[PDB]
Design a protein around this ligand. Structure first.
Ligand SMILES: [Mg+2]
Lengths: 55, 342, 60, 61, 231, 90
């Protein structure tokens, strides 16, 4: 089952990367090539009918 | 040669944006569309030995780095730039960084500039007192005194002559007085004294702040509070003092309330505009604090210990003389820190 | 097995736009994103718990 | 005192002292940890009010 | 080795040594990063400027010595550093600015997004004088009921009826909703205008983009006037 | 948390163990205590309430609104000194 094989290879590589350093959400789980994203939306997007009425 | 390394990251960065974009797409879909169909598949599916591996590997991987973890703890330049796609044109921020790259390398090609006066260099690259000439003083405008109509005849001995309705200060004497004043600043700095630079004319702050910084001294650019020295306990007692070693590093020792209320008197006062700071000069006299000041043709020489005859109205002349005194202090400070090392 | 099928489904949706980095590179990129969404949930819960106790015992 | 209790809870939460129940209950943990270093020997006498006479006016007529 | 006591701040002999030192620190940053461009969203009037209050800055900026113009000077430099383009900003600037942000992180907001209920109804309450009104707005065809009675029966004055219709007339949705209004207390005018206020607050859920138009018409403002005991 | 009698019997006085046992049989272990933000019943500090403080508690034997002694069983017969001196340093 390559699906379970590649998933189980991806889960253990992640374990090693997080193990290398103290696991902190902001730092360890940052976007690729990013120092860290802070653990800090409900700005609903108007529907096409809502926006048409406003226009 | 190594560009591929960066390309490998960008690939992941692009993939990450794709994963996030479609994570938000599924956040809008109602659960009734996905959940029941998803559960039904599992009801119609049978787990295999391998499938179970991830059934518990992910449970722990999510029960270790998501639930049982510490949410908190008890590219270096411009790291927040959002690069644009290789097909899209440069963003406004990228154009700024693209221009900065040009400014460092190309923008200065073709010629060098010599024998041109740059105002900022008077503050940041002051000359040493021994290298000062009459030409340099004259280039700074130090010789331009006040109108002959405003003459304070007590300055007669500093005057070289009158020209174009103003008195010309004798720069030969200015140089000798400046060298003497500079040596005093160097001595006090090398001895560890408190040097205060006072100047309240518009524009002097920049020169005053740098002079204090390079001599480890103090400055006042806004207003001299009458009584700062004679009534120091009612004005300056509340402000914080600190103990320092011979290297001017804070010892960190907490100070007894007795030591924090005692008057802290300057060892030397430098006044850029003495005609507007009579209060400070009289307090210095009352407090036996030696003083240095630029003495223009309408200014009283005897009110200061070490007068420097010179134009006090031009920022260039003032910053030129202040720069020389500030560097003299710096050399004294460097000689004191050097004798401590060896 | 929603633990697995939901993550497989997520890649299926991304597969729509895709219409083998996806074997190990994308798979990892997804697990990490989920962990950052499960850590923000836990951060929000702490704020609720702290706002429902008496953070200010003596004056406020 | 207010910053000593907030720190106590922040630490008792960051150390984890049912995920579904982790969205309803607000019980932070052991009473001792929440009130660590807050005893009768240092809290009561420091918060008591009206403890110092600072003014007095005596009139006759 | 020999130790001596010296003033802590370079501005010790100034009128307000604490404020001048803080200004100097910000001025250094504005000099070191003079080239960095400023936000072009400033024209878009980004709604972010949570700086500490004058009284809060007086704890760190000289206390009684602190003058209002000195606080104004601090804000002009805090905003200028804050308005540097977010992409091109650095840690140094943000570190310095963090100490001046009003502390509101330990606490959270008390507002939860309003949504239609299980039957598609928007429920809002309004008050005028001594009257109160609870309205149920749902999408419909312009049917209105006041306390179970026809509008013309309950409200005899046409001006009271026109007041109830005004919020729907602003969003041009008079024939798009069914209103079930319940009112109690005060008299006809208080109840009619309390219903008016409650309909306006209930219409914002159907389209939050029309709140600005409702506010501009004046139907979302609670009328404060009440009978005052003569003093 | 519910503790075994052994542990509780090494820290609390015997007279108070029966109350602790009855409370551990009436309050279920899975009780989710809530914090009141209207009425503050407990003090702002932690206290087991096992010892009578000479100052912060009512003086034993003194008459007061919540005195539990009978009116003929008070033990304050001298009134020339302040009954409750200030706590700590004094
Ligand atoms: Mg002059």
């Amino acid at each position: 089952e390559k699906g379970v094989d590649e998933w189980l290879e991806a889960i253990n590589e992640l374990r090693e990367e997080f193990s290398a350093k103290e696991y902190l959400p902001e730092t360890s789980l940052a976007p690729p090539g990013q120092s860290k994203v802070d653990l800090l939306g409900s700005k609903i997007k108007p529907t096409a009918e809502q926006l048409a009425q406003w226009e | 040669p190594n560009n591929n390394d960066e390309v490998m990251l960008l690939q992941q960065k692009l993939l990450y944006d794709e994963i996030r974009s479609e994570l938000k797409s599924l956040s809008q879909v109602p659960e009734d569309e996905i959940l029941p169909e998803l559960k039904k598949s599992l009801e119609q599916d049978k787990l295999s030995d391998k499938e179970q591996q991830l059934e518990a590997e992910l449970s722990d991987f999510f029960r270790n780095y998501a639930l049982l973890n510490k949410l908190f703890d008890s590219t270096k330049p411009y790291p927040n730039l959002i690069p644009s796609a290789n097909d899209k044109p440069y963003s406004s921020q990228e154009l700024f960084l693209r221009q900065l790259n040009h400014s460092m390398r190309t923008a200065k090609l073709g010629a060098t500039i010599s024998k041109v006066y740059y105002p900022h260099k008077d503050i940041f690259y002051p000359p040493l007192p021994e290298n000062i000439t009459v030409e340099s003083l004259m280039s700074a405008g130090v010789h331009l005194g006040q109108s002959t109509s405003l003459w304070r005849s007590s300055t007669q001995s500093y005057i070289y002559g009158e020209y174009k309705g103003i008195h010309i200060i004798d720069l030969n004497q200015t140089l000798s007085y400046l060298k003497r004043a500079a040596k005093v600043v160097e001595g006090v700095s090398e001895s560890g004294g408190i040097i205060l630079f006072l100047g309240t004319r518009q524009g002097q702050k920049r020169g005053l702040e740098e002079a204090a910084k390079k001599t480890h001294g103090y400055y006042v650019s806004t207003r001299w509070i009458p009584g700062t020295l004679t009534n120091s306990t009612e004005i300056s007692g509340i402000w914080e003092k600190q103990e320092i070693d011979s290297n001017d590093n804070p010892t960190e020792r907490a100070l007894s309330p007795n030591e924090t209320s005692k008057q802290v008197k300057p060892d030397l006062l430098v006044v850029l505009n003495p005609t507007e700071n009579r209060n400070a000069l009289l307090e210095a006299i009352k407090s036996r604090v030696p003083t240095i000041a630029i003495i223009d043709t309408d200014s009283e020489p005897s009110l200061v210990t070490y007068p420097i005859p010179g134009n006090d109205d031009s920022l260039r002349s003032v910053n030129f003389l202040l720069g020389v005194l500030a560097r003299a202090g710096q050399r004294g400070l460097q000689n004191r820190l050097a004798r401590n090392n060896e | 097995l929603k633990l697995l099928n939901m993550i497989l489904s997520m890649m299926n949706k991304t597969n729509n736009n895709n219409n083998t980095l996806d074997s190990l590179m994308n798979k990892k990129l997804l697990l990490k994103n989920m962990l950052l969404d499960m850590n923000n949930k836990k951060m929000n819960n702490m704020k609720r718990m702290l706002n429902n106790n008496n953070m200010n015992p003596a004056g406020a | 005192i207010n910053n000593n209790k907030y720190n106590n809870m922040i630490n008792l939460l960051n150390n984890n002292n049912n995920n579904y129940n982790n969205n309803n209950n607000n019980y932070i943990g052991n009473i001792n940890n929440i009130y660590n270093n807050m005893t009768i020997d240092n809290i009561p006498m420091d918060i008591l009010m009206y403890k110092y006479l600072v003014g007095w006016s005596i009139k006759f007529k | 080795l020999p130790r001596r006591i010296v003033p802590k701040l370079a501005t010790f002999y100034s009128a307000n040594p604490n404020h001048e030192d803080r200004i100097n620190r910000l001025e250094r940053l504005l000099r070191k990063y003079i080239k960095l461009p400023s936000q072009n969203n400033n024209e878009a009037q980004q709604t972010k400027a949570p700086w500490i209050s004058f009284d809060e800055y007086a704890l760190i900026g000289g206390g009684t010595k602190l003058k209002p113009t000195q606080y104004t000077q601090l804000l002009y430099m805090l905003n200028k550093l804050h308005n540097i383009d977010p992409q091109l900003t650095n840690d140094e600037i943000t570190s310095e600015l963090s100490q001046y942000y009003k502390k509101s992180s330990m606490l959270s907001n008390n507002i939860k997004i309003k949504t239609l209920d299980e039957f598609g109804r928007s429920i809002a309450v309004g008050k005028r004088k001594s009257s109160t009104a609870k309205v149920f707005v749902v999408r419909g065809t312009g049917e209105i009921l006041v306390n179970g009675r026809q509008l013309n029966d309950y409200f005899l004055k046409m001006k009271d009826r026109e007041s109830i219709m005004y919020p729907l007339q602003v969003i041009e949705s008079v024939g798009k909703y069914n209103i079930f209004a319940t009112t109690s207390g005060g008299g006809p005018t208080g109840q009619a205008e309390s219903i008016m206020h409650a309909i306006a607050k209930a219409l914002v859920v159907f389209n939050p983009l029309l709140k600005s138009r409702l506010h501009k018409a004046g139907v979302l403002t609670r009328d404060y006037r009440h009978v005052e005991r003569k003093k | 948390q519910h503790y075994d009698e052994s542990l509780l019997s090494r820290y609390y006085p015997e007279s108070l163990l029966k109350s602790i046992k009855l409370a551990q049989q009436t309050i279920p272990e899975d009780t989710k205590f809530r914090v009141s933000r209207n009425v503050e019943f407990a003090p702002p500090y932690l206290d087991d309430f096992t010892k009578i403080h000479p100052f912060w508690d009512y003086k034993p034997g003194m008459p007061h609104l919540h005195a539990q002694e009978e009116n003929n069983n008070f033990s304050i017969f001298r009134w020339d000194q302040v009954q409750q001196p200030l706590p700590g340093e004094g």
